[PDB]
């Protein structure tokens, strides 16, 4: 038959927000635990704490989503991303998409006020 | 109408060969076995004759 | 008759059940003949002989670029812009080639020429976008844009493959005679 | 239809190629069909049962090797396949060797059909004779006003297709090739999904290859007859 | 008896037709009786599963059943396992985006019965948050198709054992076959020498895409058509 | 118990399906079981029940009237007798699942009015 | 072991005439003993890699 | 048996002459086999760019489509006579069950028929009450077959298979590949 792969979870839409909260915290634990494996697979310059910080920021972004269906989709996609990272299916190039700040300073001029944005036609 | 079109011959083309054509060749297997036996036996005759004559040369030396 | 959940065409054909496989004891060939075939590799030797027969046949190779493979009047190679026998350009900037182009490889600009003619001021083909389908040549109402039979125009830089109007007109001037052979052979079929 | 008519000397040349292609096939069969090493690599390799073949979405040889006589050319005839005579090869072991034999027999049946087409090619038009669908011939386009208008419109806007949808399938060389096209009544298809037989075959790989050795996997890939432009479209 | 004297086929007398005769026939006509049969067949199915079959449609030789998502498993089971249907092969699963509908996505299943030499189509609907029941339990071949449908459209399939992207790049954001996804996407790649790696950046095109669909016709092109319904499937008129 | 499918023995021409030793009793048993399931769990009014009853009765009559497998499979018209046994088993399992699904009822999800609107 | 068996015959082929009939008998006994070990290896299927996964051959039975 | 072996001198391939032909016939696995090299004077000659037929080719057409005097376009406009897609929801089929059909009516005239059509079109009768109310005659004629059986999944063109055995088969008896016609 056609069997599932490493760290594959069948898609199940949780009927309750608490039963989803359990699964979500388990996924967060999985990510935090895989951080050192990630740093080894993807030959990263930065530290393991930086990876774990990034993971926290990712999970933080959806801290206030209310609709159960949306949380279900966010969870299923987050698990897909975990499976992609832990199996080394990603290359370094796509993994480093998650760490834009880790790259060096892009230049002297990142405008913040109106006048600087207006001088670069970005007002 | 139809002028200058590529068309088939009035009688058609002669049939082409499309069925498998791999005819059996060679003597029956036992003929090859008999030939192998004969070759090996003649070779053994010669080799043993040579060994025996070599032994008599050894005696002379 | 009347079928339930079936039909005559879903009935098994006559003889669909296969015959039982024969056992070893019901074999026509004696074990010594089979062993002869087995140990002396009979069919392998037949295969070797078939390969050896080829060794004495004429090879198929041609000595490019001193010889050339077959080319037909319909062949789609590098693009050119053609003229009338007077020397006037044939393209009148209808932009049908640009509209039909499946790869959006053609970019055209036009306006009225100082003599009043409708003519292009810009005709570009991105040869690295083009798929060499020949749709532009089919679409053109005046046989202006054509594909020559030329395939030997590889370049060392990509910038050389962005053809502007001067390059395409020069190609037309260069290849007009071969273009005329191809047209004389295939125009009735278009 | 087709975009242009056949050139003048083509049927004769196809016939002369056909008179020798049979020998060309015989010599390949001399190298392969009875070779004991070929059989060691193909017999009982990549076995699929008939029921599992149906359940996995396999088609073409991948299906006919398991003993099921299905072929769209005979079951749902299209363009001229009803007018020509040919046979359909069906396997029984559902393995790579049966599929090889099927493909070699299909060579011969195609040669048969090509000869019948060389003998029965009729006269007339090669595209539909409505200039609202296909472009008119060039000498009409440069002489007749309606023809020029229709040519202009076909090459700039395209014809409009009545709204609706279809799934259409043919017996492509690698199995059943289908398209599901949805028309919204405009000149551009609303939706177009391609059903590639190689997609379903590669999907079935994990079921078929389990428990084999790695070279058996190479042989199974070869028996599926995969081209990857088909696979990922 | 040598190839040196093989006869020249190039000079054999060819056939010459004076006029070609091709009668005028509507292609749809050949379907009429079959259309009737499909109607009858669909009536039976709807009479047998009235809990499930929202409706059916018939176009020339293609029969479609329309069902709610929760109906998918029973009806499919019926289609696979009933003696008069026996649709053992799954042909394809895809989605179609209809942004005007409250449920964006219609999920389309095509099935083949080699037993009866017959095809059938089944439709249901879904949104970006409401999943569909996976039919992998009934057809193993469905597996990859549902994955493609998830990758291209974002439709989820409940019960799918291993549901992940199959076509797009790892970490690809978006579902490209949605009508609101732009043709060239949002991001492009290049090789970066400073970083020594392939990098992703916001899309920038040396030549912008030119969309010529602005030249679509200002006149309705085809009209209404004609109806091919059999008389046994039209409501009677009083008197 | 009923022997549905042999998975070894004499191959018949379809991979994975082998010759059934005693197929007519297997057919009769499976047909009895499905008629019993319909009579005990399906409404006498339901169209599903009428159709499956009449079909099963027809096939059972054909099996009981005929001793020879090839005659039977020509009259049934749905493949070799092994495939007919597999079909009867499939129909029985479908009938038992139908008892729980209850398809004779009114439909539970009506479509919204916009749901099935195309471009015509 | 098989390599050592083969290489132990070198003294025999270099001394065959000198030991002629007695040594011929002895070398036959030696070969037969080693062939018993070859027999053990062949009958135990010691060098066969068995494909762990095999097609299921169980019948399908339904409890009616 | 058509398709059978044809001699090598009937194949458009170069081959050998003289003493070498005798040698090849003595040494070939299969003497009737061609070499595969096309005969240069015969093959693809004249070249496609110098065909005489090009100067006589005319656009081909068929009667009556090419007639100048009796074909209005709208009589052969098949694109605009396309079949409409017929959609049936359960209300329509309810109406078919109760009121019968245009082919075989079971409706009364006057206001009665229009009001019956209206009250099925509003929701008065459900599909299941429609089915339960339906008589044996309706159920057998118009849902099942006249024998009470269900209709089978229909086929546009039924295919009767035949198995070719013996000499006309593609492979001989041993091979695990049969010939279906
Ligand atoms: C013991 C049983 C004796 C029975 C008996 O009397 O048979 C007589 C037997 C003929 O009876 P047969 O078995 O029925 O064969 C007749 C067939 O027509 C077989 O003749 P064929 O025309 O089919 O092919 C003959 C050809 C088979 O090979 C070929 O067909 C072409 C080979 C080209 C050779 C290129 C060099 O011979 C070979 O080349 C075999 C040798 C392969 C290496 C050389 O004749 C011989 O005894 C000749 C023996 C020669 C032994 C050579 C093997 C080494
Ligand atoms: C009749 C009485 C006989 C008395 C005893 C015989 C005396 C010795 C005879 C000398 C030849 C013996 C050596 C060859 C024996 C080969 C036997 C064989 O077929 O091996 C088969 C083996 C698979 O094993 P098995 O299970 O038995 O096969 C059943 C498959 N369903 O799979 C294989 O290994 C395939 C065979 C291997 C072939 C190797 C090919 C490599 C190169 C081919 C050399 C050909 C000649 C090259 C020279 C050019 C020609 C001039
Ligand atoms: C470089 C110099 C060229 C060498 C190339 C080798 C050419 C071999 C030609 C094929 C002969 C063949 O294979 O004969 C095939 C035969 C089997 O015949 P059958 O199928 O039972 O026919 C049965 C029907 N009859 C009999 C009515 C016709 O094999 C055998 O039983 C034993 C194998 C003998 C082949 C040993 C080859 C030795 C070559 C060594 C160098
Ligand atoms: C198991 C094996 C049984 C074989 C029985 C065959 C006997 C046939 C009679 C012919 C002998 C003969 O008459 O020729 C005698 C030959 C050569 O000796 P010579 O110099 O010519 O005789 C003169 C005696 N002097 C020297 C004292 C003066 O001696 C041989 O060794 C040849 C035997 C034939 C080869 C048999 C080998 C069989 C294959 C073995 C593969 C394992
Ligand atoms: S050949 Fe095709 S792709 Fe190239 S410019 Fe012409 S129309 Fe465009
Ligand atoms: S090349 Fe031809 S089609 Fe293109 S703009 Fe010029 S005239 Fe029009």
Number of spatially distinct domains of chain A = 1
Which structural class do you get from the secondary structure elements of chain H? alpha+beta
Order of helices and strands of chain H, N to C? Answer: HEEEHHHHEE
Distance between the termini of chain H: 16 Å
The chain pair forming the largest interface, with residue counts per chain, is: E-H, 69 and 70 residues
Total of helices of chain A: 5
Membrane topology (chain A): Peripheral membrane protein
InterPro entries (chain A): Complex1_LYR_dom, Complex1_LYR_NDUFA6_LYRM6, NADH_Ub_cplx-1_asu_su-6
Protein name (chain A): Complex 1 LYR protein domain-containing protein
Pfam families (chain A): Complex1_LYR
Protein architecture, described:
The structure is cut from a larger assembly and holds eight protein chains of eight kinds. Helices cover 52% and strands 0% of the residues of chain B. Chain B is an all-alpha fold and 61 residues long. Chain D has a three-stranded antiparallel beta sheet with strand order 2-3-4. The longest helix of chain D has 25 residues, at 96-120. Chain D starts with 9 loop residues before the first helix and ends with a helix. Chain F is built from four helices and one strand; from the N terminus they run βαααα. Chain F has one domain (1-120). At the E-H interface, strand 1, helix 1, strand 2 and strand 11 of E face strand 1, strand 2, strand 3, helix 2 and helix 3 of H. Strand 1 of chain F pairs antiparallel with strand 1 of chain G, so a sheet runs across the interface. Chain F: Belongs to the complex I NDUFA5 subunit family.
Give a nutshell description of this structure.
Chain F: It is a peripheral membrane protein. This is part of a larger assembly, with eight protein chains of eight kinds. Chain D has 233 residues and is mainly alpha-helical.
Please tag this protein with its features.
part of a larger assembly, 8 chains, C: 190 residues, alpha+beta, two-stranded antiparallel ribbon, H: 181 residues, two-stranded antiparallel sheet, 5 helices, elongated, binds cardiolipin, binds 1,2-Distearoyl-sn-glycerophosphoethanolamine, binds diundecyl phosphatidyl choline, binds iron/sulfur cluster, NADH_Ub_cplx-1_21kDa (chain H), Subunit NUIM of protein NADH:Ubiquinone oxidoreductase (chain C)
Topology:
The structure is cut from a larger assembly and holds 8 protein chains of 8 kinds.
Chain B: H1 29-60
Chain E: E1 20-21, H1 32-48, E2 53-59, E3 62-67, H2 72-81, E4 89-97, E5 105-113, E6 118-126, E7 132-133, H3 142-153, E8 157-158, E9 187-192, E10 197-202, E11 226-227
Parallel strand pairs in E: 3-6, 7-8
Antiparallel strand pairs in E: 2-3, 4-5, 5-6, 9-10
Chain G: H1 2-7, H2 10-13, H3 20-43, E1 60-62
The complex binds cardiolipin, 1,2-Distearoyl-sn-glycerophosphoethanolamine (3PE), diundecyl phosphatidyl choline (PLC) (2 copies) and iron/sulfur cluster (2 copies).
One iron/sulfur cluster (SF4) binds at residues 91-97, 108, 139-140, 142, 144-145 of chain C.
PDB class: oxidoreductase
Keywords: Complex I, NADH dehydrogenase, Mitochondrion proton pumping, Ubiquinone, Oxidoreductase
Entry title: Cryo-EM structure of a respiratory complex I
């Amino acid at each position: 038959a056609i069997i599932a792969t490493a760290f594959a979870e069948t898609v199940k839409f949780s009927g309750s927000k608490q039963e989803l909260q359990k699964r979500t915290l388990a996924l967060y634990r999985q990510f935090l635990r895989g951080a050192p494996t990630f740093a080894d697979l993807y030959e990263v310059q930065f530290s393991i704490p930086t990876i774990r910080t990034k993971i926290r920021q990712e999970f933080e972004r959806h801290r206030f989503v209310d609709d159960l269906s949306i949380q279900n989709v966010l969870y299923a996609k987050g698990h897909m991303e975990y499976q992609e990272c832990i199996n080394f299916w990603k290359q370094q190039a796509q993994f480093l998409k998650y760490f834009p700040e880790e790259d060096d300073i892009q230049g002297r001029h990142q405008p913040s006020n109106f006048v600087d944005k207006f001088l670069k036609n970005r007002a | 109408p139809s002028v200058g079109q590529d068309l088939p011959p009035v009688g058609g083309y002669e049939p082409v060969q499309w069925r498998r054509n791999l005819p059996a060749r060679g003597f029956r297997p036992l003929v090859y076995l008999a030939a192998l036996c004969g070759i090996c036996g003649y070779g053994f005759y010669r080799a043993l004759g040579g060994i025996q004559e070599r032994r008599e040369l050894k005696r002379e030396k | 008759n009347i079928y339930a959940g079936g039909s005559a065409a879903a009935a098994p054909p006559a003889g669909f059940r296969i015959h039982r496989p024969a056992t070893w004891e019901e074999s026509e060939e004696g074990a010594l003949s089979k062993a002869t075939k087995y140990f002396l590799l009979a069919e392998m030797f037949r295969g070797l002989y078939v390969v050896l027969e080829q060794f004495f046949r004429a090879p198929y190779t041609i000595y490019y670029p001193f010889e050339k493979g077959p080319v037909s009047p319909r062949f789609r190679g590098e693009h050119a812009l053609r003229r009338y026998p007077s020397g006037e350009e044939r393209c009148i900037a209808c932009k049908l080639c640009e509209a039909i182009c499946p790869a959006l490889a053609i970019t055209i600009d036009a306006e009225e020429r100082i003599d009043g003619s409708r003519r292009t001021t810009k005709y570009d083909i991105d040869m690295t976008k083009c798929i060499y389908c020949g749709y532009c040549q089919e679409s053109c109402p005046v046989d202006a844009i054509v594909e020559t039979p030329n395939v030997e125009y590889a370049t060392e830089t990509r910038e050389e493959l962005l053809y502007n109007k001067e390059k395409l007109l020069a190609n037309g001037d260069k290849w007009e005679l071969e273009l005329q052979y191809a047209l004389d052979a295939d125009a009735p079929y278009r | 239809g087709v975009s242009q008519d056949l050139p003048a000397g083509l049927l004769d040349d196809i016939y002369m190629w056909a008179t020798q292609f049979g020998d060309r096939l015989d010599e390949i069969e001399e190298l392969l069909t009875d070779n004991r090493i070929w059989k060691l690599r193909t017999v009982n390799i990549g076995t699929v049962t008939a029921q599992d073949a149906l359940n996995l979405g396999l088609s073409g040889p991948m299906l006919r090797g398991s003993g099921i006589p299905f072929d769209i050319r005979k079951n749902a005839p299209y363009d001229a396949y009803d007018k020509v005579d040919f046979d359909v090869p069906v396997g029984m072991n559902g393995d790579c060797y049966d599929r090889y034999l099927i493909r070699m027999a299909e060579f011969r049946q195609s040669l048969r059909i090509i000869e019948q087409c060389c003998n029965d090619m009729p006269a007339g038009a090669v595209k539909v004779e409505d200039f609202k669908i296909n472009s008119p011939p060039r000498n009409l386009m440069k002489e007749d006003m309606e023809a020029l208008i229709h040519h202009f419109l076909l090459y700039t806007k395209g014809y409009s297709v009545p709204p609706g949808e279809t799934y259409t399938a043919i017996e492509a060389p690698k199995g059943e090739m289908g398209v599901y096209v949805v028309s919204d009544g405009s000149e551009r298809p609303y939706k177009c999904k391609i059903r590639a037989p190689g997609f379903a075959h590669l999907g079935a790989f994990d079921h078929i290859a389990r428990g084999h050795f790695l070279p058996d996997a190479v042989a199974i890939i070869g028996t599926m007859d995969l081209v990857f432009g088909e696979v990922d479209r | 008896p040598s190839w040196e004297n093989i006869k020249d086929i190039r000079l054999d007398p060819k056939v010459h037709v004076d006029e070609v005769y091709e009668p005028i026939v509507n292609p749809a006509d050949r379907y009429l009786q079959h259309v009737s049969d499909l109607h009858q067949y669909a009536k039976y199915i709807m009479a047998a599963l009235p809990k499930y079959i929202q409706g059916f449609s018939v176009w020339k030789d293609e029969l479609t059943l329309h069902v709610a998502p929760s109906a998918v498993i029973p009806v499919t089971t019926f289609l696979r396992d009933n003696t008069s249907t026996q649709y053992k092969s799954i042909i394809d699963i895809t989605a179609v985006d209809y942004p005007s509908r409250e449920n964006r996505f219609e999920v389309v299943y095509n099935f083949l019965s080699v037993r009866h030499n017959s095809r059938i189509r089944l439709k249901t609907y879904a949104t970006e948050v409401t999943p569909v029941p996976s039919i992998t339990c009934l057809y193993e071949g469905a597996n990859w198709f549902e994955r493609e449908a998830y990758d291209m459209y974002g439709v989820f399939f409940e019960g799918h054992p291993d549901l992940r992207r199959i076509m797009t790049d790892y970490g690809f954001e978006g579902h490209p076959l949605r009508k609101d996804f732009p043709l060239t996407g949002y991001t492009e790649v290049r090789w970066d020498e400073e970083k020594r790696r392939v990098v992703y950046e916001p899309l920038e095109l040396t030549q912008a895409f030119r969309n010529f669909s602005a030249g679509s016709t200002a006149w309705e092109p085809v009209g209404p058509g004609r109806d091919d319904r059999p008389d046994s499937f039209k409501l009677p008129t009083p008197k | 118990s009923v022997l549905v499918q042999m998975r070894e023995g004499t191959p018949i021409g379809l991979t994975g399906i082998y010759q059934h030793p005693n197929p007519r009793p297997a057919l009769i048993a499976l047909y009895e079981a499905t008629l019993k399931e319909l009579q005990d769990k399906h409404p006498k009014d339901s169209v599903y029940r009428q159709s499956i009853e009449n079909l099963t009765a027809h096939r059972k009559q054909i099996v009981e009237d005929n001793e020879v497998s090839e005659v039977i499979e020509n009259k049934i018209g749905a493949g070799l007798i092994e495939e007919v046994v597999i079909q009867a088993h499939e129909e029985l399992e479908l009938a038992k699942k139908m008892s729980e699904w209850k398809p004779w009822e009114e439909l539970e999800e009506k479509p919204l009015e916009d749901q099935w609107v195309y471009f015509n | 072991p098989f390599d050592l068996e083969i290489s132990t015959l070198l003294p025999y082929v270099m001394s065959i005439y000198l030991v002629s009939n007695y040594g011929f008998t002895i070398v036959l006994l030696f070969l037969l003993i080693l062939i018993i070990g070859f027999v053990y290896e062949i009958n135990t299927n010691a060098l066969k890699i068995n494909k762990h996964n095999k097609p299921n051959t169980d019948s399908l039975i339904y409890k009616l | 048996l058509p398709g059978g072996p044809v001699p090598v001198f009937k194949k458009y391939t170069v081959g050998s002459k003289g003493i070498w032909e005798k040698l090849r016939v003595l040494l070939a696995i299969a003497p009737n086999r061609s070499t595969g090299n096309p005969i240069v004077p015969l093959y693809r000659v004249p070249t496609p760019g110098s065909r005489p037929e090009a100067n006589v080719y005319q656009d081909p057409s068929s009667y009556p489509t090419n007639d100048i005097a009796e074909n209005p376009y709208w009589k052969r406009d098949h694109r605009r006579a396309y079949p409409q897609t017929a959609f049936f929801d359960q209300k329509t089929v309810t109406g078919l069950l109760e009121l019968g059909s245009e082919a075989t009516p079971r409706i009364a005239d006057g206001e009665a028929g229009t009001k019956a059509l209206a009250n099925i079109a509003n929701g008065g009768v459900s599909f299941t009450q429609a089915l339960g109310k339906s008589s044996k005659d309706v159920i057998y004629g118009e849902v099942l077959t006249v024998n009470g059986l269900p209709p089978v999944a229909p086929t546009l063109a039924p295919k009767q298979w035949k198995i070719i055995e013996g000499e006309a088969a593609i492979y001989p008896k041993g091979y695990p590949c049969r010939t279906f016609h």
